Structures are given as structure tokens and as C-alpha cells.
Design an enzyme around this catalytic site. Structure first.
Site, PDB file in Angstrom:
ATOM      1  N   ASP A   1      -6.523  -9.023  -4.551  1.00 35.96           N
ATOM      2  CA  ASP A   1      -6.514  -7.584  -4.307  1.00 35.96           C
ATOM      3  C   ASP A   1      -6.712  -6.812  -5.591  1.00 35.96           C
ATOM      4  O   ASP A   1      -5.739  -6.474  -6.272  1.00 35.96           O
ATOM      5  CB  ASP A   1      -5.206  -7.136  -3.665  1.00 35.96           C
TER       6      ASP A   1
ATOM      7  N   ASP B   1       0.876  -1.188   0.000  1.00 32.24           N
ATOM      8  CA  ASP B   1       0.000   0.000   0.000  1.00 32.24           C
ATOM      9  C   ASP B   1       0.922   1.250   0.000  1.00 32.24           C
ATOM     10  O   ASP B   1       1.954   1.275  -0.703  1.00 32.24           O
ATOM     11  CB  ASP B   1      -0.944  -0.102   1.236  1.00 32.24           C
TER      12      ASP B   1
ATOM     13  N   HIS C   1      -5.977  -7.476  -0.033  1.00 32.66           N
ATOM     14  CA  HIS C   1      -5.094  -6.325  -0.027  1.00 32.66           C
ATOM     15  C   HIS C   1      -4.126  -6.298   1.157  1.00 32.66           C
ATOM     16  O   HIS C   1      -2.922  -6.122   0.986  1.00 32.66           O
ATOM     17  CB  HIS C   1      -5.937  -5.058  -0.022  1.00 32.66           C
TER      18      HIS C   1
HETATM   19 CL   LIG Z   1      -5.011   5.277  -0.116  1.00 34.29          CL
END
Ligand SMILES: [Cl-]
Length: 302
Positions: free
Chosen positions: A250, A123, A280
Site C-alpha cells: 500500500d 484509511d 490498501h
Molecule cells: Cl481519502
């Protein structure tokens, strides 16, 4: 800038997280100082594995991976982004920019004094971390990218990202723990959800969490476009070992996997993996499996 600190009482008895809080101080950028929280575990002379989390998580996300890395003889370091976890939290959304996060994280790495780092990123941990690899390639011995990317703003981010972005702005109350549950295939326990809510006693602590999705470059007039293009070009010259370890479930980042793998020369000949049965937040679903892949990759690249 004005800055809040989450009371320590919020972090009492978090399950499966027996790691002592450590802190460094960095320049705020406008004349003050911010404290950042990190974990430092395993043999003091071990090869460093730097574990970077993203939105809206914190180093708690890496709790299943740390013991595997430590048992393998590695030194696991995990740092909480400004706005998150046990780090200090500027109160204005305008205090958070891609540049600021990059500068704050680099300052933390420098202050801790890390060298020859194996980055593991997911991320925003990777949006920041991969930019740092581009800007300071000599600091990084190896890179593991998992469910992340380095967008310049030149390519459409995909409908899955846009749906997340819209939710992040529209939802009346921002529930960090339920967001992490939302992006996991496993059902997170009530205590795990609470651990992700611990940093945020109320909305005044969540400016960084609200702003992050607006910082993702999705058009070429983004303030981060010039620096990200330069970092991307530098990543395209990164010859040191690079492992793709994305998960299979994801939609937000899946399309990025082959673009990243194809771009970095140091990915050539590495044994890339797909982490099966993980969303994710793959560290929640299959943290041990991802940590085992990191150990294998480190050992294969002495
Ligand atoms: Cl974000």
C-alpha cells in the site's frame, strides 16, 4: 442540512454478510438528526473490538474479520460513517468536515455505549479513530492501526495519496466498488463490487465520498490542523497497547507506518506485524490474517 437515506432494497442478499443492521441516532450538528448503521456481533459480554472503515467503503469491508473475532470470544462492532454504507447521507459536500465526522462517530460510540474498546482502524477509519483515541484515551483499552495515519497537515502526504486525491475529484462517475478493487491485490468479484456500490444509487448519495479526499490535511492551514496536532500530542502519551498491522503493498500509507509506530509509547514491546500480500484495503485481501493478528494481540495484553 438536507439528508438522503439509501433505500433498503439496495442491501438485499449481499454475499458473506449475514449480520443484522442496527441503528443509532446522532445530532446532525444543525438542529436535526442522522441515523447511523452498525453491526454488533458475538457474545454480549465479550471484549469490544471496534472496526472502523474509511473511504469509500463501509462495514461490508470487515465481513471476513468479524467471524474470526466472534469465534475467538470477542464482541465485534463495526460502524458506518455518515455518508457511507447504511448510514444517512447529507447531500452537500460542505456538510462533511473532519470535525463533523469525529463528532458523529463519537456520538455513535457513546449512544451504543461501548467501553474499554480495542480499536481496529484503516484509511479514514483511523484518521477519525486515532483522533478519538487522542481526545478520549480512557475509552480505548488497545489500538490496532492498519494502513492509516493521523496527519496534522505538517508533512507532505506523498505522491500516491495525491494521485488518488486527483482521481477522486476528476473521475466523471465515482465507482466506489471499482475504487476498492483498485486498492486490493485480489480481484474482487462482480457481487463484491456491487456491495460497495449498494450505498450509492446515484451521485446525489456520494457527497461524503467525493469530499473525503479533500478533508485530508496536507498543509498546516487545514481546518483540522489545530485539533489534529492536539490529538497527535495526546497519542504520543498513549501508553496502552498499540499494534502496527500495516500491509506490504500500500503505497498510500506505507511511509506512515514507522512514524506512527515510533510515536506511540504503547507500541514499545508489542509484536508488530506486516500483513503480507495485501493492498490498501487489506481486509479484502487478508482479512482472516489481520483478524488473527488482532486476536493474538488482545490475548497477549489481558
Ligand atoms: Cl481519502
Amino acid at each position: 442540512m438536507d439528508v438522503l437515506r439509501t433505500p433498503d432494497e439496495r442491501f438485499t442478499a449481499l454475499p458473506d454478510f449475514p449480520f443484522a443492521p442496527r441503528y443509532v441516532e446522532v445530532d446532525s450538528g444543525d438542529g436535526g438528526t442522522l441515523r447511523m448503521h452498525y453491526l454488533d456481533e458475538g457474545r454480549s459480554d465479550g471484549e469490544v473490538v471496534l472496526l472502523l472503515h474509511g473511504e469509500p467503503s463501509w462495514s461490508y469491508l470487515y465481513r471476513w474479520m468479524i467471524p474470526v473475532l466472534v469465534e475467538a470470544g470477542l464482541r465485534a462492532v463495526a460502524i458506518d460513517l455518515v455518508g457511507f454504507g447504511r448510514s444517512d447521507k447529507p447531500t452537500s459536500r460542505d456538510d462533511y468536515t473532519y470535525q463533523a465526522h469525529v463528532d458523529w462517530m463519537w456520538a455513535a460510540i457513546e449512544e451504543i455505549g461501548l467501553a474499554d474498546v480495542t480499536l481496529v482502524c484503516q484509511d479514514w477509519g483511523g484518521l477519525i479513530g486515532l483522533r478519538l483515541v487522542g481526545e478520549h484515551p480512557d475509552r480505548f483499552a488497545r489500538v490496532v492501526a492498519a494502513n492509516t495515519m493521523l496527519p496534522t497537515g505538517d508533512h507532505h502526504p506523498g505522491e500516491a495519496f495525491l494521485a488518488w486525491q486527483k482521481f477522486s475529484q476528476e473521475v466523471p462517475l465515482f465507482p466506489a466498488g471499482q475504487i476498492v478493487n483498485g486498492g486490493s491485490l485480489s480481484t474482487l468479484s462482480a457481487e463484491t463490487i456491487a456491495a460497495y456500490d449498494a450505498p450509492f444509487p446515484d451521485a446525489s448519495y456520494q457527497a461524503g465520498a467525493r469530499q473525503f479526499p479533500m478533508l485530508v490535511p496536507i498543509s498546516p492551514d487545514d481546518p483540522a490542523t489545530p485539533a489534529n496536532r492536539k490529538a497527535w500530542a495526546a497519542l504520543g502519551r498513549f501508553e496502552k497497547p498499540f499494534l502496527s498491522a500495516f500491509s506490504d503493498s500500500d503505497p498510500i500509507t506505507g511511509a506512515a507506518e514507522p512514524v506512527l509506530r515510533g510515536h506511540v509509547p504503547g507500541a514499545r514491546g508489542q509484536s508488530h506485524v506486516t500483513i503480507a500480500g495485501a493492498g490498501h484495503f487489506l481486509q479484502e485481501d487478508k482479512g482472516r490474517e489481520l483478524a488473527e493478528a488482532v486476536v493474538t494481540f488482545v490475548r497477549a495484553n489481558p
